[PDB]
Amino acid sequence: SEFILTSDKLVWTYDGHKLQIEPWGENSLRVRATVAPELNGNDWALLPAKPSTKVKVSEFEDSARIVNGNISAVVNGRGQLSFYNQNGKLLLEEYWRTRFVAGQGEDTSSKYFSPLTHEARELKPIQGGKFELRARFESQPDERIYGLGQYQQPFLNVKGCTMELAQRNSQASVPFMMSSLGYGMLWNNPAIGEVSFANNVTTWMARVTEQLDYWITAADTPAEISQQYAAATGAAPMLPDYAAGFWQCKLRYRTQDELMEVAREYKRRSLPISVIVADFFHWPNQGDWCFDTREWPDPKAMIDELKEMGIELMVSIWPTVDNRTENYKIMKEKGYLVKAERGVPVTMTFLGNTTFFDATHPGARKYVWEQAKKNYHDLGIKIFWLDEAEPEYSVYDFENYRYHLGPVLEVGNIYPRGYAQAFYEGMEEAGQTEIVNLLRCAWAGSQRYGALVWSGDINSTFGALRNQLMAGLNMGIAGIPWWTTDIGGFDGGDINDPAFQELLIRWFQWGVFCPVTRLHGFRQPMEEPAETYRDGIAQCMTGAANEIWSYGEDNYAIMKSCLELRERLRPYVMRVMKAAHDTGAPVMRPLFFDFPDQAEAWQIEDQYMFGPDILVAPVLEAGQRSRKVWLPEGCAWIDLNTGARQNGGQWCDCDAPLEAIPVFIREAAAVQAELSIALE
Amino acid sequence: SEFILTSDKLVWTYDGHKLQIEPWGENSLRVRATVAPELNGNDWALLPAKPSTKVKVSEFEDSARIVNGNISAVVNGRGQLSFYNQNGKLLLEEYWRTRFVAGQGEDTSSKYFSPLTHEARELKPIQGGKFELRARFESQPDERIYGLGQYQQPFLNVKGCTMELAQRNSQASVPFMMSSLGYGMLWNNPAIGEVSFANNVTTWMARVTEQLDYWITAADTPAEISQQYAAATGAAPMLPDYAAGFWQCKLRYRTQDELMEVAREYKRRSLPISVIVADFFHWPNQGDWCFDTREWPDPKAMIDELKEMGIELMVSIWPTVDNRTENYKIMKEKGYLVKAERGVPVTMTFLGNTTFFDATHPGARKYVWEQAKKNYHDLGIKIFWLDEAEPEYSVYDFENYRYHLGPVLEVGNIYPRGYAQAFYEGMEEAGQTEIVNLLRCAWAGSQRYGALVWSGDINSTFGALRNQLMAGLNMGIAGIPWWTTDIGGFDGGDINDPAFQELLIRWFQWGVFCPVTRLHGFRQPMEEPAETYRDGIAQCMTGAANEIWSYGEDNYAIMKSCLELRERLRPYVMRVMKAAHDTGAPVMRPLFFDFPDQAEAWQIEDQYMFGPDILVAPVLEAGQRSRKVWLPEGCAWIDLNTGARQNGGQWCDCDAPLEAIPVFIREAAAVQAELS
Amino acid sequence: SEFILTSDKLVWTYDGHKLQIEPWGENSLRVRATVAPELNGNDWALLPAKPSTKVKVSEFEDSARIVNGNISAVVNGRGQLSFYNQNGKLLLEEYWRTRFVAGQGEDTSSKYFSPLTHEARELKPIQGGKFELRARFESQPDERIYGLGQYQQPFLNVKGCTMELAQRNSQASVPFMMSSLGYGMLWNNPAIGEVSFANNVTTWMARVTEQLDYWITAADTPAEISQQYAAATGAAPMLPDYAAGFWQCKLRYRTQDELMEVAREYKRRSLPISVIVADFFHWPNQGDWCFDTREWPDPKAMIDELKEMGIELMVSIWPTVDNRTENYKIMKEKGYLVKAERGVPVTMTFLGNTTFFDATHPGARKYVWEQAKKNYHDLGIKIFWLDEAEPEYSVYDFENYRYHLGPVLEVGNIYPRGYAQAFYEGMEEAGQTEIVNLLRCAWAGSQRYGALVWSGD
Ligand SMILES: O[C@@H]1[C@@H](O)[C@@H](O)OC[C@H]1O
Ligand SMILES: O[C@@H]1[C@@H](O)[C@@H](O)OC[C@H]1O
C-alpha cells in the first residue's frame, strides 16, 4: 500500500492498481483507476477543468484526504474510497466485501469484512484483450436518484431500477446522475454496460474498457449540482427564437406540393407555425443526402416561400449509406463507414442494405456534413433532423460492430454525440450562430452541440405518455435541457379513433409546457406507396394526416388554443432557455429543483416546473376529468384556467376537463402578465 | 406461430423456439423453452410429479390456455405468456418490448410495443457453444418478494434487490422465491448468473445453459406455497432428537484431550450438551479424511466416553484433496476431481495445494463417502460437518472450473446439493435413519439430503446479526427449514472485550429460538501453532476458548439459563420439525407465514415466528434495553419473561434487559405450559 | 484504392487498411499494416535505421514501387505486394485468393482469382478486442528456409515444417528466417502464434496483435543477409576470453565445499577449466537471490580462491518469486510480478508456489538486477545463469497470463529478451565490459544483450 501525494493530487497504488483522484472544477473531483502501466489520454465528455480554489491534500490515520471546496475524498490504507461534503456528511462510499485487501487483513469490526470477495474497483482482465469493469458502491437507505438520460419506464426516482448503458431507439444513455444526498456523478465512460441502483448495492459496469473514470461533484442544492455539471461537460448554447414556436411534422409529407399546402393552410387559418418538416425518404437513395427532384422539383423555391411565411424548413438526415450509392463507394474507400465484426457487411436492412457512417471518425463527420451543406444548408436550411442517431442497428448485437475509436462494446455510446457534433461544428464553421438540430439520441455533453433530443418511436398510449414525462425530466437532470416528444406518440394512433384523440389532446396540452412544442407521428390508417419499388429501390409509405384540423372541430378548437397559449409563452420560454445556457438548469424540471427543502418535492413524480414560474400537472389517464395537485410552499399560485388565487403549501382537487390540464403560475412572476387568464 | 395441444400439455413454437407448459404437482406448472431440436432430460431440483387429475388445456381466439387447479397459463398468438390464479387475478406476466415478434407486428395499444427489442425468453447463442439465457417478467408496484436462499444483506423483502446466482462462503443460492401476489417460483437451473427484482423489470439470467426451465405454483396462502414447493423438490426428513439440544464448537479443539476436557466440564457442571465438534485440520493432510493419531491417539475411546455422557461427536469434513496424498493419486486416476480450465491444476491454496472432489460425479461422491465411512462412521460418528460446501475456490473465477456435469458456469450451483447427497445417501445405505449433516451451502432441494445449513464465516458484529436474521428467514422461505448460525458470529470476537460479550449474549438469546442452537466461532486472541510446518505440511492455528464459562460469571449465568430454556423448548421444536417434514413449513418464519391477512406481518423484518406459537423480537443493537414489539391480531399473547397477558393487534414497548429478549407465547398453546 | 507517396515512403490504403513500406537499413524494407486509425509506436526488435540515400519511389499504370538497393517492393492497385531483387528475380509474393479485393474485381488470368476469399494481410477483429493476424505468402517450389530459432526437430531446412511462435523449455522462437531465394525476413511481432512453411502456402500467424510488422532484406550471399540482420536488431558484443574455455557444471553442486573440491581437483590434474557453476536451489528460497549460508558459508572466499585458480564462478538465477519471501511482498506492492488472468495467482508450483518477475516491466528488471548485484555481482561474480527464461509456466496456457506490456498472447515471446536485458544493462551500468550470461531462451535481438543460449532440458 503506497500513497503518492502532491499538494493537489492523490494517488494510491498496490499491485499495479493505480487510483488517481484530483480536482476537476469547483466542488468536484475526477476519479480514475487502471492496472495498465499508466492512465490513458481519454477524457471523453470532460472538458478541461478550470483551476481550483483552495485544494488541500492531507494524511491522517494511515489514510489520505483530498478536499476541493464542498467535496472531499478519503482513501484509507487498504485503498478504499469514500466521499463527504463540507459538513462531514457521507455522500458515497465504495462497496468492499473481502477478508484480505491491498496485502492486508480486513477489519472484522467493519461491514467490509466478508468471505464473498467483491472489490469496489473490479478491473477483470478479458483474455487477450482489455478489461471488464465493475464499480461497486454501497446503497443508502434514504437515497433518491435522478438523471441517467431517457428511459422508457414510469419512474422519476430510479433508486431500485437497473438501466442499460446502451443506445436504442427511444432510449438515450446520458450517464450523469443526481442524488438526494447532495452530490452528482458522471460515469465518464462510453462503453456498453449497465447501472443498477439496487437496494442492496450500486454497481456500474463496462463490458470493455481500459480504465475506471468518473466525475463527482457536491453542492447544497440541485441547481448548483446542475451548474457544476454544465461547467464540466459544456453549456447548452442559446436556443434560436424560432425553436420556441410550433413545429409541424408527420410521417410523411411525400412531395414539395404536399408540404407547402400544409404550410399555406396554417397561414390561411392564421395559426402559429415556426417550423415545418420534410421526414425521411424524400431522397433518391440512402446516403445521397439530397432532395429527390421527382417529388421535390424546386427546393430553393419552397425554402424561399417558407421564409416569406416566417417558417423554417427542417429536413430528415439518415446516417445510413446504401451500398448502391456513389457515396458508399467513396466512404468505403476512405474508411468512413462502421464495420461489422462478423457476417455480412450490412448494419441495417430498412428499405435497402445500408451501412452507418462512423460518427466517431472525424473524417466521416466532415464528409457527411459537407454533403448536407452542399445539398441542404447552402439552400437556406438551418435545422437538421438527425434521426437514427443511436444508431439503429437492425439487430442490437453491440459485440458485432466496430468504430474508428474501437469496438462498440468499448466506445459505442458516444456515437450520437459525434453525430450531433458533425452538424454543429459544420454549421458553426459555415457562419450559423444559433444552432439547434433534432437528435434522436445523446451521450454526456451532447447539449454543447445544440442537441434537441426527442424520445423516438414510442407507441401512442397513456402508458407511453407517463414514461415520456419521467424520461424528459430525467434528461434535464442529465444536462440535456432541449428535449421534446412526438405529440401523440409515434406509433398506433388512428386519426378517427376516440381513444387516440383523447390521448392526442392530453399529450398536446403537456406539449405546450415542454421545452419544444412539436407535433409528429406515424398516424393510421397508413398508405402503401403507389409503386413498391422504383429503379430497384424500395419506396417508403406514409401515415395519415397529422395537422391540428385533422381530428374534428372540437379537437381543432382545443389544439388551436394550445398553439395560441404556446405563442404567449414564447418570451418566457426564451428567458428559461437563456437560463439553461447561463446556469445548466433544465427547462422542464422536477419540483425539487425549485423547492429542494420541501419533502413533497422529492416524492411527487406527476407534476413538474416549466421554468421557475409555472407548475404543470399533466393528465396521464384516459377518461380522467379531475386530479389532485400539490402547490409548493413559499408563494401564492394563480390557476391558469380559473384565475383563482391559491396559497402555497396545500393540495387542491383540480378540475381537469378535456379542454385543459391543471396549470398554476407563480403569483407576480413576469409570465403572469404575459398570459391571458380567464375568470371562471 | 403454432400450438401443439394435448389434454395435459401446451406447446407453442416459432422458428425453432419451443415453449412447453405442463402440470407439475397440484396448483403448479413447469415451463420450459429451447431453440435446440428438443428439450433435454435435465430435471435438476424437480422430483417426478404426482399426476394432476384436474388439468385442462383450451384454445380461444388466437390464444391457448392450460389450467392446473389454482394456476393457469395463457399464451397468446405471439407466444407471450402470463399467469393467473383461480379468481382470474394476474400473478405474473412476461416482459416483451418489441415491434415484431413471432413473425407478427406487435400490438401498438400494448406496453409490449417498443423499438428497444427485448424478448421475455432470450436464448442468446454463445459462439461455438450453448446459450446465455435471460428470462424477463414485468415488475409490479405492489409486489413483495422473499426466499432466494441466504444473502448477506439487511433485507427480508428483496423487491428492488439483485442477487447473484452463485455459491460463495456465507452465501447460498437456493432460487425459490415467494411473492406477496400469491405465487412461488423455482428457477430450476443451476447455472451461474443473477436474479434482479428491479423496480422496472424482473430479470433472471443464466451465463451458460441449454434451455429455460422454471416451476411456478399458486395458492391463497404462503403455507400452501411452501407445501407445494416441498412436494416439488423434496421434504426435509425428520430431525433426530439430539439435533434439538446444544451444539458446542470452536475453532478449534486441537487434540482429543482438549475436546474431552470441555465435554467433561459441561458434565461436571450438569449443563445441557447434545453435540460436541472437532473442527478442521484434525487430520494428517487434506484428503486423508481421518484423525491424526499424534493429536487424537484413540478416537474410538473419545466417542465411547462421549456416548456414556450422552453426547454425539460431529467431525469436520473438507472436500479438498492435497496433491501429496494417496487419495489424490487414486482420485486423479479415476477422474473424481474438479478441473481447472486453465493454469495450474489447483483449486485452493489454504495450507496446501488442493483440488476439490467433484460432488456432481456419482463415483466421486461414493469414493469420498466410503473414506468417511471407514475412518469415522464405522467408529460411531453419525454427524458430519460438510464445510467448504460451495466450494470455496481461492479465487471465484467460475469460468475457470469444470465439473463432471459440465462447466461451472452451466452447472456450478448444484455442487453443495451433491456434497450433502454424498453423505446422506451413504449414511442411509449404512442403515442410519433421521440423518442430519451441517452444510455450509445449499441449492434447491438440499433439504431432502438432511442439510442443516449455517451462514458461514461472517464477522462478529451487530450488523452481521441483523443480516443473519434476514438470511435465515429467507432460507426457510426457500425450503431450507434446518438452518443456524455461529452464535456470536465467526470472525473478530475477543473473549475479554465487553462489547463482544454483549453481542454474544444477544446472539445466544436469538440462537435459543433458531432451528438449531449452536455455539461456534474463531475467537480472539488467536494462537499460532507452535510449529508452522510438520513433515512439510502447514499447521493450522486455533482461536481462544468458546465455552459458556469462558466469558465471566455474569455471562455464564445468562447462557446457562439459555441452555435450560432451550431444553424446555425441545418438545415444541420436535413438533415444529415434524411439521416442516409433513408440510414444508419453515421452522423460523416471517410474520406473514402465520398471519398473511395482516398488513403489518408483510412489513416487519425484525420479528419472526418460531413455529406457530412463539413470537420472537431479537435485540439487534448494542446498548439497547427496550424495543417496540408488534403483537399480531387474533390471539392473546403471554410474555415469556413476566407471564403477563397482552391482547393481539397492538404495539407494545417491551423491556429488553441484557438478561432477556422480548418473546411472546400464543395463549393456550401447548408450549405455554411447557415453558413455565 | 489510393497511394500516398513521398520520396522515401510508399503507403497504400483502402477502407481503413493502411499498408506502409519504407527503407530500414541498406538493401532492406520495413512492412507494416493496420486497420487502426494509425500505426502504433512499437518497434519491438528493430533498432533505428541508418538513413538510405538512394531510395526510389515511383508509380506506374495503377501500381506503385519502392526500391532500396538490392530489394524492391511492388504494390499493385489492389494493394497486393511482391518483392524483387536487383536482378528482377522474385523473392517473396503475397498469397491472395479472391474474386473481389480493394473494391475491384480480381484478374481472372491470375492465380489470385478464386472464390475461396483468402487475404494476404488478414487482420481479423477479435470481438471487444484487438486483431488475429494471418500474413500469407505464396510458397515457391525450390525454396529452402533456415533460421527461426531453436526447435527440437531433425530438420535444418524447415520448408514443409510448421513452428510454434512460443517459448517453452528447450524451444526458442527467434523469428528471423533466411531463404535460399536470396532474402531474409524478420517477423517483428512478439505475439503467440505460428509460422507454417507449408508446400502449398506460407502463413505467419499472431493470436493477438495491433498491427502487421515485418522487416525484409535482400543480398547475393547468406553472409550479407546475416550482416544486414545484425545491423537491424543489434550486433553480438565481443565475447570475454574466459567464455571460450571449458565450463564445468552439473545438477547440482549442493555446497561450497563440494564445488571447490571439483575446482581444485581440476587444477590438481592440470586440466583446463575456465568456468565452474553453482546450479539452482543454492538459495534459502526462490526470490531471495542470495547464497544460503548454511551450505555456502563464505561466498567471497570461494570467489577469491577460484580467481587465484583462473576460474570464473557462474550462479543460477531463477525468475521465480515464492510467495513467502520478502521480495514477493515488495514486488507485489510495486506491480513487478506476472499476473494470472484467472484462477490461483501462481505461475509455477516447482518446490513452492511462485510467481515470475515481469521481465517486460522496466522497474521489475531493475529490481531483480539490483538484488543480484547486492548479493552476487558485488562479490565478484561476472556470469549469471538466467534459467527458466521462457518463462517455464507449469502449464503453458498462454491465454491465462498477462505482462506489463499486455497479455502474453500479444507480447509473450519478448520475455527472454527482457530477462537478458535486465542483467546486461545492469552489469554494463556497474562498469563490466564484455558481458556474457547463459540464457535458456531468446527472441529477435537477444544477441545484443550478451545472450549465450543453451537448448534446455
Ligand atoms: O420519427 C421517426 C423516426 O424515429 C424514424 O423512424 O424515421 C421516421 C420518423 O417519422
Ligand atoms: O466455521 C469455519 C468454517 O466456515 C471454515 O472456515 O473452517 C473452519 C470453521 O471454524
Side-chain angles (χ1 to χ4, degrees), chain C residues 96 165 185 211 272 325 360 363 382 413 432 451:
Chain C
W96 292 88
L165 302 181
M185 177 169 163
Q211 57 183 43
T325 58
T360 78
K382 291 194 163 186
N413 296 334
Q432 190 175 327

PDB file of all heavy atoms in Angstrom, chain C residues 96 165 185 211 272 325 360 363 382 413 432 451:
ATOM      1  N   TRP C  96      -2.952 -14.250 -52.252  1.00  0.00           N
ATOM      2  CA  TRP C  96      -4.325 -13.759 -52.324  1.00  0.00           C
ATOM      3  C   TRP C  96      -5.137 -14.779 -53.113  1.00  0.00           C
ATOM      4  O   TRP C  96      -4.633 -15.342 -54.085  1.00  0.00           O
ATOM      5  CB  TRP C  96      -4.379 -12.415 -53.058  1.00  0.00           C
ATOM      6  CG  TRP C  96      -3.733 -11.290 -52.319  1.00  0.00           C
ATOM      7  CD1 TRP C  96      -2.423 -10.921 -52.367  1.00  0.00           C
ATOM      8  CD2 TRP C  96      -4.374 -10.383 -51.424  1.00  0.00           C
ATOM      9  NE1 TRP C  96      -2.203  -9.836 -51.549  1.00  0.00           N
ATOM     10  CE2 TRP C  96      -3.385  -9.486 -50.956  1.00  0.00           C
ATOM     11  CE3 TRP C  96      -5.693 -10.236 -50.967  1.00  0.00           C
ATOM     12  CZ2 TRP C  96      -3.674  -8.456 -50.051  1.00  0.00           C
ATOM     13  CZ3 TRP C  96      -5.975  -9.214 -50.063  1.00  0.00           C
ATOM     14  CH2 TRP C  96      -4.969  -8.340 -49.617  1.00  0.00           C
ATOM     15  N   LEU C 165       5.327 -20.245 -32.673  1.00  0.00           N
ATOM     16  CA  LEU C 165       5.900 -18.994 -32.186  1.00  0.00           C
ATOM     17  C   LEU C 165       5.512 -18.858 -30.724  1.00  0.00           C
ATOM     18  O   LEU C 165       4.593 -18.120 -30.372  1.00  0.00           O
ATOM     19  CB  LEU C 165       5.415 -17.794 -33.014  1.00  0.00           C
ATOM     20  CG  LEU C 165       5.696 -17.847 -34.523  1.00  0.00           C
ATOM     21  CD1 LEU C 165       5.191 -16.587 -35.198  1.00  0.00           C
ATOM     22  CD2 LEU C 165       7.180 -18.039 -34.799  1.00  0.00           C
ATOM     23  N   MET C 185      13.901 -12.485 -43.712  1.00  0.00           N
ATOM     24  CA  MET C 185      12.688 -11.852 -43.196  1.00  0.00           C
ATOM     25  C   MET C 185      12.589 -12.022 -41.674  1.00  0.00           C
ATOM     26  O   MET C 185      12.689 -13.145 -41.164  1.00  0.00           O
ATOM     27  CB  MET C 185      11.452 -12.443 -43.880  1.00  0.00           C
ATOM     28  CG  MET C 185      10.122 -11.903 -43.366  1.00  0.00           C
ATOM     29  SD  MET C 185       8.717 -12.377 -44.389  1.00  0.00           S
ATOM     30  CE  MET C 185       7.368 -12.041 -43.265  1.00  0.00           C
ATOM     31  N   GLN C 211      -1.163  -4.770 -35.099  1.00  0.00           N
ATOM     32  CA  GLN C 211      -0.772  -4.493 -36.483  1.00  0.00           C
ATOM     33  C   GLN C 211       0.245  -5.499 -37.030  1.00  0.00           C
ATOM     34  O   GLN C 211       0.987  -6.125 -36.274  1.00  0.00           O
ATOM     35  CB  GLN C 211      -0.173  -3.074 -36.585  1.00  0.00           C
ATOM     36  CG  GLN C 211       1.027  -2.830 -35.667  1.00  0.00           C
ATOM     37  CD  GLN C 211       1.551  -1.405 -35.739  1.00  0.00           C
ATOM     38  OE1 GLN C 211       0.779  -0.451 -35.762  1.00  0.00           O
ATOM     39  NE2 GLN C 211       2.871  -1.258 -35.750  1.00  0.00           N
ATOM     40  N   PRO C 272      42.401 -28.100 -18.117  1.00  0.00           N
ATOM     41  CA  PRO C 272      41.807 -26.786 -18.384  1.00  0.00           C
ATOM     42  C   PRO C 272      40.401 -26.638 -17.788  1.00  0.00           C
ATOM     43  O   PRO C 272      39.598 -27.560 -17.873  1.00  0.00           O
ATOM     44  CB  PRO C 272      41.732 -26.721 -19.914  1.00  0.00           C
ATOM     45  CG  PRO C 272      42.603 -27.823 -20.419  1.00  0.00           C
ATOM     46  CD  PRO C 272      42.602 -28.871 -19.358  1.00  0.00           C
ATOM     47  N   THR C 325       8.323 -15.090   0.525  1.00  0.00           N
ATOM     48  CA  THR C 325       9.554 -14.307   0.618  1.00  0.00           C
ATOM     49  C   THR C 325       9.273 -12.829   0.827  1.00  0.00           C
ATOM     50  O   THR C 325       8.168 -12.342   0.565  1.00  0.00           O
ATOM     51  CB  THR C 325      10.431 -14.459  -0.642  1.00  0.00           C
ATOM     52  OG1 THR C 325       9.697 -14.048  -1.805  1.00  0.00           O
ATOM     53  CG2 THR C 325      10.908 -15.905  -0.805  1.00  0.00           C
ATOM     54  N   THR C 360       9.174  -7.869 -18.858  1.00  0.00           N
ATOM     55  CA  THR C 360       8.760  -6.766 -19.724  1.00  0.00           C
ATOM     56  C   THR C 360       8.541  -5.448 -18.964  1.00  0.00           C
ATOM     57  O   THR C 360       8.304  -4.424 -19.592  1.00  0.00           O
ATOM     58  CB  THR C 360       7.487  -7.091 -20.536  1.00  0.00           C
ATOM     59  OG1 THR C 360       6.323  -6.958 -19.708  1.00  0.00           O
ATOM     60  CG2 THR C 360       7.551  -8.491 -21.135  1.00  0.00           C
ATOM     61  N   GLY C 363      10.820  -1.351 -14.378  1.00  0.00           N
ATOM     62  CA  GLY C 363      11.003  -1.326 -12.926  1.00  0.00           C
ATOM     63  C   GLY C 363      11.329  -2.677 -12.311  1.00  0.00           C
ATOM     64  O   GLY C 363      12.142  -2.756 -11.385  1.00  0.00           O
ATOM     65  N   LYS C 382      30.830 -12.593 -12.242  1.00  0.00           N
ATOM     66  CA  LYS C 382      30.729 -11.888 -13.531  1.00  0.00           C
ATOM     67  C   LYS C 382      29.801 -12.565 -14.552  1.00  0.00           C
ATOM     68  O   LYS C 382      29.587 -12.024 -15.633  1.00  0.00           O
ATOM     69  CB  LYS C 382      32.127 -11.740 -14.143  1.00  0.00           C
ATOM     70  CG  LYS C 382      33.031 -10.779 -13.378  1.00  0.00           C
ATOM     71  CD  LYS C 382      34.271 -10.389 -14.179  1.00  0.00           C
ATOM     72  CE  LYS C 382      34.926  -9.146 -13.591  1.00  0.00           C
ATOM     73  NZ  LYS C 382      36.056  -8.652 -14.433  1.00  0.00           N
ATOM     74  N   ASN C 413       6.478 -13.503 -26.295  1.00  0.00           N
ATOM     75  CA  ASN C 413       7.761 -14.034 -26.764  1.00  0.00           C
ATOM     76  C   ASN C 413       8.978 -13.131 -26.460  1.00  0.00           C
ATOM     77  O   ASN C 413      10.103 -13.617 -26.459  1.00  0.00           O
ATOM     78  CB  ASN C 413       7.675 -14.405 -28.255  1.00  0.00           C
ATOM     79  CG  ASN C 413       6.679 -15.527 -28.523  1.00  0.00           C
ATOM     80  OD1 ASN C 413       6.398 -16.342 -27.648  1.00  0.00           O
ATOM     81  ND2 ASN C 413       6.136 -15.570 -29.734  1.00  0.00           N
ATOM     82  N   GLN C 432      31.054  -3.314 -15.888  1.00  0.00           N
ATOM     83  CA  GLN C 432      31.550  -4.519 -16.567  1.00  0.00           C
ATOM     84  C   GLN C 432      31.438  -4.377 -18.090  1.00  0.00           C
ATOM     85  O   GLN C 432      30.397  -3.979 -18.614  1.00  0.00           O
ATOM     86  CB  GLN C 432      30.802  -5.772 -16.089  1.00  0.00           C
ATOM     87  CG  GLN C 432      31.415  -7.091 -16.560  1.00  0.00           C
ATOM     88  CD  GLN C 432      30.736  -8.318 -15.968  1.00  0.00           C
ATOM     89  OE1 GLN C 432      30.271  -8.292 -14.828  1.00  0.00           O
ATOM     90  NE2 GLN C 432      30.693  -9.409 -16.736  1.00  0.00           N
ATOM     91  N   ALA C 451      23.582 -12.708 -24.803  1.00  0.00           N
ATOM     92  CA  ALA C 451      22.845 -13.929 -24.526  1.00  0.00           C
ATOM     93  C   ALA C 451      23.545 -15.131 -25.143  1.00  0.00           C
ATOM     94  O   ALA C 451      23.534 -15.312 -26.361  1.00  0.00           O
ATOM     95  CB  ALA C 451      21.417 -13.814 -25.045  1.00  0.00           C
TER      96      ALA C 451
END
